Design a protein around this ligand. Structure first.
Ligand SMILES: O=C(Cn1c(-c2ccccn2)nc2ccccc21)Nc1ccc2ccccc2c1
Ligand SMILES: O=C(Cn1c(-c2ccccn2)nc2ccccc21)Nc1ccc2ccccc2c1
Ligand SMILES: O=C(Cn1c(-c2ccccn2)nc2ccccc21)Nc1ccc2ccccc2c1
Ligand SMILES: O=C(Cn1c(-c2ccccn2)nc2ccccc21)Nc1ccc2ccccc2c1
Ligand SMILES: O=c1[nH]cnc2c1ncn2[C@@H]1O[C@H](COP(=O)(O)O)[C@@H](O)[C@H]1O
Ligand SMILES: O=c1[nH]cnc2c1ncn2[C@@H]1O[C@H](COP(=O)(O)O)[C@@H](O)[C@H]1O
Ligand SMILES: O=c1[nH]cnc2c1ncn2[C@@H]1O[C@H](COP(=O)(O)O)[C@@H](O)[C@H]1O
Ligand SMILES: O=c1[nH]cnc2c1ncn2[C@@H]1O[C@H](COP(=O)(O)O)[C@@H](O)[C@H]1O
Lengths: 347, 351, 350, 347
C-alpha cells in the first residue's frame, strides 16, 4: 500500500518550464570552452551528437559532425556489411570519430564484430526501454568481449535504470523516454519522464560513478541544449535540428514553394518496413550543417557567458534554474510583434 | 461550518496531467497478459468495453467486440423487445459475451426480465448521477430478484459513492462524471471530477471490497487507457474511439473527401428525442471513419502491451499495484506529443 | 515593518474554469429542487438571476420580462432622472413586478434616488468601479439615513475588507466583481482585480457573518459557472452577455454577414461614456438569442441538474455543503467536448 | 548544495498576477504620478523610451521629455551623431535627455562627447549587467564624472543589482529576456520572469535607496502598474512606443493598416548597421505620442485609485498582488464577445 499511495507524488519538468538564472561572470562567450570528454578514448570539441536515425545520420552527416568537432551515429537500418562500410568511410576521411547504433537482437554481436573491425569509436545499444533485462544482459555480454570499447546504452529516464546500465558495463548512458519531436511513445503507451527532470535524475546517479550522460531528444532551440547541459548532461543528441541539413540522408523536396527533407521516427511505420511509437513528416531545408552548428554553439557560448561558465563542468555544477508558468513561456518568446523576417536561430 | 473552509482544498488530475514512469522489466510486450476478471462469471481477454450509446454499440458491434476478447453494451434507446432480440443475437453467434444497459425507470425490471431470459451476461444500470438514491434503491431491487446476475452500476466519481453502490449489490462500479468526448455535463451543470483522479479515488475504495472499477470516458489515445488501468481500473469504456469503426451503428458520410460517422451524447437533443424537462448534457457530432473494429483494437492493445512492458508488468494486477506516475505541466504535454515537425502521414494510432 | 513588502505575492486566486463541483449523495431529482432565493424580506426571487444594469442589457422591456420569469432587472443609469423614474413606474405598473435601478456616486445621486423611490423602486444599485472607495461608503451612509427601509445594493468589491465596509455603511446586499466581465478591460488597463470565484468566496465568507447576501457579477459564460458561483457563496448571480442578445434587451437586431447580432458594450467603453478617465471596457456584438424565456430555461435547467448532482434541496444547502475540486488546463479541456466534430448546436453550448 | 538547489526558485510575470483592490479615499484625477530617480533627474511621468534604433532618436526624446518622461538616444550611430542628437534635444527648451553607451574600449570617448553635449544621464547598456566588464566600466565613469547619472543594466538578480550599486551606478535597469522582440531566453536559455526580476532587484536596491527601472515585457498599461507595484520607480517601453509618430522610421501600408518597423538591437538588422538575440518585425502605427502617453498615464491613475495610492511610493510599499492561472488571465481579458472596434487602450 506504499506503492498505492505514492502513485502521484513525483513531479517533472521539461525545457519550456524553466529558465537559467543569470550569474556573476568574468568570462566572455568568445572565451568559453565547449569541449567535452565522454571517455579517455572519446573526446569532443563541441557537445553535439547527431541521432542514429535513417533520416538523420549516415556517412556524410557523420563526417560533417566530426569536422565541426561533434559526433555522428550511423543508424542500424541497413545490413551489417553496409553499416561497417559507412563506419569505415568516416574513418577513411582523416581518422574522424564515428559511432554506430546496434539493437538488442540475436545478430547484435555479429554486427558489433564488423563494426569493431571497422574501427568504430563507440556503439550505441539502442532500445526503447533501456531498463529492460535484455538490454542489461547484452551490455554485459558486449562488455566482456570488448573491455576497451566505448559502450553507450539507452534509453532510460530514471536513476534506478542508470545505475543498472552502468553496472552492466555502460560507460555512457543515454537519457530520454518520449521527448522526441517525432515520438509518440508517451501518447500510445502513456510512458515517459519530462526530459529535463529525466536528465537531472539520471545525471544525479551518473555523477556518483563518474559516468557522463547524453541528453537525447526534445531540443527545439539552442537554449534547450544549454538547459540540458546545465541539468547534468555532458553532451546532447539532436534529431530534428539536424534533419533539414544538406548532409542528412534523403532528398530535398518542394512543398508549397519551400524546400523540405523527410524526417521520421525510427518507430514510425515507414522506418519499420510491434505497434508504432513514431511519426513521419518533414522539416525545412537548412543548407550545410556548418551554419546550424554555428548557431547552436553560438547560443551555447552566450548561455555559458550569462552563467559565468568558463567550461561545461562549471555549468553542470553551478548553473541554477528558475521555474515559470505558461505566461512566463509566452514572455520568453517574442510577443505582440509581427515578425517580418526569419532569424538564423528562430523559426 | 467546517465544510465552508474545505471548499477548495481538493485537487484533481487527468490523463494529460501525468505520465507513467518506466521501471525494471524482465517482460516483453509480446509476453504480457491483458486478461481481466470482472466477476465469477465475467472474464474479458482484453480490457475493452464499448459504450452503451445509440451511436456506438448494437448487435453488430457487440459481436465484433466479443470476438476480440472484449465486451459490448447494447444501448437502451430501443424497445424492450428489440434489445432482448439483439442480446439473443450476440449469444447465438457462438457463445459470445454481451452486456446491456438499463435506465433507472419504473419499467426497469420489465426490461431486465426480458434481458435475463435472453441470457444477458451483464446489466449496466446507467444514470447521470450514480450517487442518486433512486439508483441505489434500484440496485437493491435488482440484486434481490437476481442474486446471480452481474450488475454494473454508475456513474460515480467519489469513494463514498462507490461504497454505496457496492453495498447495494453492484459487483462492478463504473467511474466517470463529465470526461466524455461528447459530454457537456461539467460545462452546463458545473459538476465533475477529473477522470484519472476519479478512477484513482473510486479504485481505492473498491479495492477494499474486492470490486472492479470501469474507467468510462475521456480516453482519446491508447496511452490514456494504460494510464487508467494503472490508476486502478480493471477495464475501460470507450465511446469516441469506437464510434468510427465499421461495426458501429449508422452509415458513413463524407467530409473533406474523407469518411465520417455520427457520434453523439446520450444526453444530446437528438438522443433524448429518440429515447423518449431536462436540459441537454451532451452534443451531437461525428468522428473519422476507421474501418473494421479489429484494426482499432489491435492498436489499442498494442499500446497497452508496450506500456505494460515499460512498467515491467506481466499482468494487469501488477500494473494496478505498482505503476508509478509523474506529474507534468502544459509544456510537458506539448513535449509528449509530436512537435515542431509537420506530419505527412496519419499513423494507425495517432490522429 | 517589512510585512507589506513580503506579502506582495502570497495570495492565490481561482476562477470558474479552475474548478469543478464534486458530485455527492443526492436524495433529490433536478425537477424537485427549489431555486427560490431571499435577498431581503421585501425582495424575494423565484430564480437566482439578475440582469445587469447596462444600457445594452436592461430597460423596461427587459426588467418586466426578468420579473415575470421570477428574476430581477436593474434599469441602467444612462438616462435622465425623469426617464429612469418613468422606466421604473412602467415596470411597477405592469402587474406589480420587482424592479431595481442603478445609481452612480455623483453629486446628483440623492436627487435621482428620490425619484426612483417616488416611482416605488424596490432596490437601488449603488454602482461604482471601486466599491472600497470612501465616496461610495459615504453615499451608502447618506441613503441609509434618509431611507432606512430601502433596499441598497452596493458594489463592486472583491475583498472581505471591502465587503465588511459596505455592510457597516448600511448596504443589505453586496455585489461582487472587479474585472471578470466579458466586456471588461479593467484588469488589462489598470492591472487590478481578483479572480471571480475566489472573489465571491472571500466576500461571502465575510458577508455570511452578517447575514448579508452576495451577488456574483460578471465572468459567467456558461450555466455551470452560475452553479459554481452560487456554490461558492453567492445568493444570486448577475449576467450581462448571456442576456445581451435576447429579444427584450435594448437595441435593435443588426445583421452582420447574414447572421443577426445585437450590440453589447461595456459601461466604461468609449461609446457608453459619451451617453478625463480612460476606457475600462470594449464595444462588441453578441448573437441574437430570441426570447428571454428560452435563455432562462437553459440556465435554470443547468442549475437544477447541478443542484441534483450535489444533493442540494435548496440554494442554502448548496452554499453550505457543496465542495469543489481544483484542476489544470488539461482538466478544463477534458471538461469541454473534445476530439469530436460538432455538427449541430446545443441550446446551452455555444 | 549547489546541485540540489537547481530547481527550487519560482518566477512570476505580469500575466500571472493581478493587483488586489484596497481601501481608497483618492480619485485617479488626484494622484501624484511624479518620480525622483536622483537629485538631478526627476520625471513627472514614470515613462522612459527605450534606447533602440527604431524607438528613440531626437524627435522621440523631445516629445517624451515635454510629456514629463525621458528618451534614451540609441548607440547605433557615430559618437559625433549621438552628441548632436543630445544637443538637439537640449536646445529644444533644456529638456532632459539620456544616451546609450555600450561596454567597449572607446566607451569613455563616447561618454566624453555625450557629457560635453550636456547629457543628463548615460545608460551603460549591455546584455549581461552582472559581467565584470560592465562593473569595471561603471567604476571608470563614476571615478571621472562623480555627478553624472549612470544607469547600468541589464540585470535580473539581487546579487547583480548589489554589484552595480556598489560599482557606482545610481540607477539600475532590470530585465533579462522579457522584451517583445527578444529571443535571449530562447537562444541562450537564460532569464528570469520579469515581475519577479523587478521585485528581487527592488528588494536589494531598496536597501541602498537606489531606484530600479523595469525594462521590457510591458504590452498593456496594466502591466506597467504591476511593474511599479512590484518595486520599480519607472518603466522602459519599446513596442508601445515604436508605432508612435515621433519614433524613427516611416509608415508602411499593409492591407489598409499602417505599420512601423520594430526590431531588437540584437537582431541581425541592427547588428549589421555573435548570434542574434532578437528579431525584426513591425508594430501598428499609433499616431502622435501624446495619445499613447495619455492612455498609459490614465491607466496608471486608474490602478493607483484602485490601490489607494496617492503617490507612486505608496504603491511600491503597499500594493498587494494575487496569483492566478491561465484561466484567470483568460477571464481578465475580454472574452466570449466579438469586439467591433479598437479601444484606445486595448489592441
Ligand atoms: O551581446 C550579446 C548579444 N547582443 C546584443 C543584445 C542586446 C540587447 C539584449 C541582449 N543582447 N546586442 C548586440 C550587438 C552586437 C553583437 C551582439 C549583441 N549577448 C551576450 C551574451 C552573453 C554575455 C556574457 C558576458 C558578457 C556579455 C554577454 C553578451
Ligand atoms: O520497441 C518498441 C518500439 N520500436 C522502436 C522504438 C525505438 C526507440 C523509441 C521508441 N520506439 N523501434 C522499433 C523497430 C521495430 C519494431 C518496434 C520498434 N517499443 C517497446 C516498448 C516496450 C518495451 C519493453 C521491454 C523491451 C522492449 C520494449 C520496446
Ligand atoms: O470609473 C472608472 C471607469 N468607468 C466606468 C466603469 C464601469 C464599470 C466598471 C469599470 N469601470 N464607467 C465610466 C463612465 C464614465 C467615466 C469612467 C467610467 N474607473 C475608476 C478607477 C479607479 C477609481 C478609484 C476611486 C474612485 C473611482 C475610480 C474609478
Ligand atoms: O439525466 C440527466 C441527463 N440525461 C442524460 C445523460 C446521459 C449520460 C450522462 C449525462 N446525462 N440522458 C438523458 C435522457 C433523457 C433525459 C435526460 C437525460 N441529468 C441528471 C442530472 C442530475 C441528476 C441528479 C440526480 C438524479 C438524476 C440526475 C440526472
Ligand atoms: O520513432 C521513434 N519513437 C520514439 N522515439 C524516437 C523515435 N525515433 C527516434 N526517437 C528518439 O528521439 C530522438 C530525436 O529527438 P529530436 O531531437 O526531437 O528529433 C532520437 O535520438 C531518439 O532518441
Ligand atoms: O450525453 C452525454 N452526457 C454526458 N456523458 C455522456 C453522454 N453520453 C455518453 N456519455 C458518457 O461518456 C462516455 C463516452 O466517453 P468517450 O470515450 O470520451 O466518448 C460514455 O460511455 C458515457 O459514460
Ligand atoms: O465597461 C465596463 N468595464 C468593466 N466592467 C464592466 C463594464 N461594464 C459592465 N461591467 C461589469 O461586467 C458585468 C457584465 O458581466 P458579463 O456577464 O461577463 O457580461 C456587469 O454587470 C458589470 O458588473
Ligand atoms: O535585440 C534585443 N535582444 C534582447 N533584448 C532586447 C533587444 N533589443 C531591445 N531589448 C530590450 O527589450 C526592451 C524593449 O521591451 P518591450 O517593451 O517589450 O519591447 C528594450 O528596452 C531592451 O531592454
Amino acid at each position: 500500500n506504499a506503492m498505492w499511495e505514492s502513485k502521484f507524488v513525483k513531479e517533472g519538468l521539461t525545457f519550456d518550464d524553466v529558465l537559467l538564472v543569470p550569474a556573476k561572470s568574468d568570462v566572455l562567450p568568445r572565451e568559453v570552452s565547449v569541449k567535452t570528454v565522454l571517455s579517455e578514448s572519446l573526446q569532443l570539441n563541441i557537445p553535439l551528437i547527431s541521432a542514429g536515425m535513417d533520416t538523420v545520420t549516415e556517412a556524410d552527416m557523420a563526417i560533417a559532425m566530426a569536422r565541426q568537432g561533434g559526433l555522428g551515429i550511423i543508424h542500424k537500418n541497413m545490413s551489417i556489411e553496409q553499416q561497417a562500410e559507412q563506419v569505415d568511410k568516416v574513418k577513411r576521411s582523416g581518422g574522424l570519430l564515428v559511432g554506430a547504433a546496434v539493437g538488442v537482437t540475436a545478430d547484435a554481436m555479429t554486427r558489433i564484430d564488423a563494426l569493431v573491425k571497422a574501427s568504430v569509436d563507440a556503439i550505441v545499444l539502442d532500445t526503447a526501454h533501456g531498463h529492460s533485462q535484455g538490454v542489461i544482459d547484452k551490455v554485459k555480454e558486449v562488455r566482456a568481449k570488448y573491455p576497451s570499447l566505448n559502450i553507450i546504452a539507452g534509453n532510460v529516464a530514471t536513476a534506478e535504470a542508470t545505475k543498472a546500465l552502468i553496472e552492466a558495463g555502460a560507460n555512457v548512458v543515454k537519457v530520454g523516454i518520449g521527448p522526441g519531436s517525432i515520438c509518440t511513445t508517451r501518447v500510445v503507451a502513456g510512458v515517459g519522464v519530462p526530459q529535463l527532470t529525466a536528465v537531472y535524475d539520471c545525471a544525479t546517479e551518473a555523477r556518483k560513478h563518474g559516468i557522463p550522460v547524453i541528453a537525447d531528444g526534445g531540443i527545439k532551440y539552442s537554449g534547450d541544449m544549454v538547459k540540458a547541459l546545465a541539468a547534468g548532461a555532458h553532451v546532447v543528441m539532436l534529431g530534428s535540428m539536424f534533419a533539414g541539413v544538406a548532409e542528412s540522408p534523403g532528398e530535398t523536396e518542394i512543398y508549397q514553394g519551400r524546400q523540405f527533407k523527410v524526417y521520421r521516427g525510427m518507430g514510425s511505420v515507414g522506418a519499420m518496413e510491434l505497434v508504432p511509437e513514431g511519426i513521419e513528416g518533414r522539416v525545412p531545408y537548412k543548407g550545410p550543417l556548418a551554419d546550424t552548428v554555428h548557431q547552436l554553439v553560438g547560443g551555447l557560448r552566450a548561455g555559458m557567458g550569462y552563467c559565468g561558465a568558463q567550461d561545461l563542468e562549471f555549468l553542470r555544477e553551478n548553473a541554477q534554474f528558475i521555474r515559470m508558468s505558461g505566461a512566463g513561456l509566452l514572455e520568453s518568446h517574442p510577443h505582440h510583434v509581427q515578425i517580418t523576417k526569419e532569424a538564423p536561430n528562430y523559426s
